[PDB]
Structures are given as structure tokens and as C-alpha cells.
């Protein structure tokens, strides 16, 4: 299926499972296995989700060869700093049961330690322990600041992105510095869900005989954004993957784009750094 190319030529599958909010053990292992069974080849996790064991279990259970799957995980705020970050990588690696990790990200920028943390990601990349390195919830100013002090520039930035918060500024900033955007959103585990409940998505979903969530995912795909919808439900997990047998029209894309309100719904990167030390 579709892949997005990072600035080091590694190809990152465009659709993945978010396991954010999945309880460890069975819940995750099932979610991951079900995803892989359905065809997903990309799992997105994070130390702080406390479910790296379960992810590893799901992957081993699926029976799919390691190199055919992409695994992303992330260094938590409290493990920022060169040596601390290096150590959190190993704790994550051991917990996933993996010899290498495909992508490792800084989970939140913070203020004082992210340049230092990035130096550790560069090391892991030189040591061939990760295939790609990037950041999450970084804003252009963070990225501009990081650019002053790095040898390898970030390859991914995973941020809140959905039809009411379309991140146009950052998208252009990332187009211009060769960075792939990954979209997360406060959906899948059943939050307020205003994002999905509007006439534009409704009628596009109805026209194609799909759900509004399937539409948003497809909209992500056709904008070349990487998308990691989270769910622990076997059916929803399957539904989120059934997005390859239809195309949104150029007009349908402008219509969804028109929904932009720059309405952030999750936490603000400039003022959010729980666990910071």
C-alpha cells in the first residue's frame, strides 16, 4: 500500500495503528495483531503509553517478519537529556523485544533539554539502532532552534492534525525543510468527537458509502500526511484500514480543507511538559 519517503530514503507506511490509550497486555497485543492481520504494517507507540510489551507481543504473534513492519516509539519528557535518552531507548528496545526500532521521536519539545535529547537520537542513528529519527509536537520555532545545533535534521514531526486543526503553517514549514508530518488526533478512544460530526464529512462519507472516519483518513492520505488512527476494537481497526478502494475528488478535498478553524483540541506544545526534570 502507500508509503511516504523520508529524507534518508526510508519509506514509511502511510497508514498505521496508534496504540495510544491501549491497556498493556491483551488489549494491545490483540489490537496490534488484528491490525497486522488486516494489513497494517506500521505500529505507533510510546514509552509513556506503558504498552511496549504488548506491542512486541502482538508483532511476534502475528507471525509477520520483523522487517516487513514499522515500529515507532518515543522518549518521554522525564527521560530527556543525552545519557537519560540513550538509556530510555534501551529500556524501550528491551520492552519491545526488538533488535532495532524503525523510528524514535522526541515526544514533546519542552524548553531546556530538547537539543541535548536530539544529540542522543543522532547517536542511535549513527549506531544503526534506529532507521529514522524525528520529533513530535514540535512547532516551527522549536524546529528552527533545533536546526542551529544539529548534524542530522529531523525526518518526521508527529503532531495534532485533523480537519478543524489543519496546521497549514507547520505543513509549509515541513514541506520546506524536508520533514514528513504524521497526524494524531483526539479520536478513536471516544473523546468529544466534534471533529467527525459535521455536514461536509457526513455527506462525503454518504456519497462513497464509507464512514466519516474513513473519509478523514483518506483525506490525510491524499495530502501525503502519515496517519495513525488509534483503536482497540477489532471491527473499527478493520474499518480504518478499508480506505484503499476509493478516492476523494479534488472538490471533496477543497471542501474538507475549508473546515479548517485552527481549533487546537489537545495540549499546546509551548505550555505542556508533564514529567519535566
**Footprint of ligand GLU (CB under 6 A):** 20, 46, 48, 107, 136-137, 184, 266
Distance CA 64, CA 34 (A): 12
Sign of CA dihedral 46, 48, 53, 55: negative
Torsion of CA 143, 148, 152, 156, to 10 degrees: 0
- Between CA 124 and CA 67 the distance in angstroms is 18
Residue 62 annotated as part of some ligand binding site: no
Distance CA 12, CA 102 (A): 9
- Least separation in angstroms between CB 209 and ligand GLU: 31
Least spacing, CB of residue 200 vs ligand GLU, in Å: 25
- Tell me which residue of 19, 38, 43 sits closest to 98, measured CA to CA: 43
Q: Is 9 annotated as a binding residue?
A: no
Name the catalytic one among 47, 49, 104, 125: 49
Q: Is 44 annotated as a binding residue?
A: yes
Residue number closest to ligand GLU, CB atom: 20
- Pick the closer one to ligand GLU by CB: 72 or 255: 72
CB of 12 to ligand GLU, least distance (A): 17
For the question of residue 125 being annotated catalytic, the response is no
The answer to whether 234 is annotated as binding is: no
Choose among 225, 105, 228, 240: nearest CA to 171. 225
Nearest-approach distance from CB 136 to ligand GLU, in angstroms: 5
Please state, in angstroms and rounded to a whole number, the distance separating the CA atoms of residues 219 and 177: 23
Binding-site entries: 19-20, 44, 107, 136-137, 158, 184-189, 230-232, 236-240
Q: Which residues are catalytic?
A: 49
Binding-site entries for NADP(+): 19-20, 44, 136-137, 158, 184-189, 230-232, 236-240
Amino acid at each position: 500500500y502507500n508509503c511516504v519517503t523520508l529524507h534518508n530514503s526510508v519509506r514509511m507506511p502511510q497508514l498505521g495503528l496508534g496504540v495510544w490509550r491501549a491497556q498493556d497486555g491483551a488489549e494491545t497485543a490483540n489490537a496490534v495483531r488484528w491490525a497486522i492481520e488486516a494489513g497494517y504494517r506500521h505500529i505507533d507507540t510510546a514509552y509513556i503509553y506503558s504498552n511496549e510489551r504488548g506491542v512486541g507481543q502482538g508483532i511476534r504473534e502475528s507471525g509477520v517478519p520483523r522487517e516487513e513492519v514499522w515500529v515507532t516509539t518515543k522518549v518521554w519528557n522525564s527521560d530527556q537529556g543525552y545519557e537519560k535518552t540513550l538509556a530510555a531507548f534501551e529500556r524501550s528496545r528491551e520492552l519491545l523485544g526488538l533488535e532495532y526500532i524503525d523510528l524514535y521521536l522526541i515526544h514533546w519539545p519542552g524548553k531546556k533539554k530538547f537539543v541535548d535529547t536530539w544529540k542522543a537520537l543522532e547517536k542511535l542513528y549513527e549506531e544503526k539502532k534506529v532507521r529514522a529519527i524525528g520529533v513530535s509536537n514540535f512547532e516551527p520555532h522549536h524546529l528552527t532552534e533545533l536546526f542551529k545545533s544539529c548534524k542530522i535534521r529531523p525526518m518526521v514531526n508527529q503532531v495534532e492534525l485533523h480537519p478543524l486543526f489543519q496546521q497549514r503553517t507547520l505543513r509549509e514549514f515541513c514541506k520546506q525543510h524536508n520533514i514528513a508530518i504524521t497526524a494524531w488526533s483526539p479520536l478513536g478512544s471516544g473523546e468529544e468527537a466534534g471533529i467527525l460530526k459535521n455536514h461536509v464529512l457526513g455527506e462525503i462519507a454518504k456519497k462513497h458509502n464509507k464512514s466519516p472516519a474513513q473519509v478523514v483518513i483518506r483525506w490525510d492520505i491524499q495530502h501525503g500526511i502519515v496517519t495513525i488512527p488509534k483503536s482497540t476494537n477489532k471491527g473499527r481497526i478493520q474499518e480504518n484500514f478499508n480506505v484503499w478502494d476509493f478516492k476523494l475528488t479534488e472538490e471533496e478535498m477543497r471542501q474538507i480543507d475549508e473546515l479548517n478553524e485552527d481549533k487546537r483540541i489537545g495540549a499546546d506544545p509551548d505550555n505542556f511538559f508533564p514529567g519535566g526534570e
